[PDB]
Amino acid sequence: GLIKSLAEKEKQLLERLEAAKKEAEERVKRAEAEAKALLE
């Protein structure tokens, strides 16, 4: 029964998907900084 293995694969993947999203939204918080600055 492999089972354990593939039920680990779903964790790794989720935290890679998670990680993509996070750095993604960081870029948004980055464009927010310039958006104030460029006006200031």
């Binding site: 029964g1 492999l2 089972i3 593939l6 039920a7 779903e10």
Partner: protein, 50 residues
Amino acid sequence: LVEEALRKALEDRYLLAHEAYAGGVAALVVVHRKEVDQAKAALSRAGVAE
């Protein structure tokens, strides 16, 4: 009967396991949360159920 049904529906992307313990053999089908619909449908044919 459950295995054949599973194989056609799922392909082989599932884990089918069984062990005896008295009171039949406990069996499991494991699928992705996306394959769930198909996996259950395979069971419906087989006549065994959740």
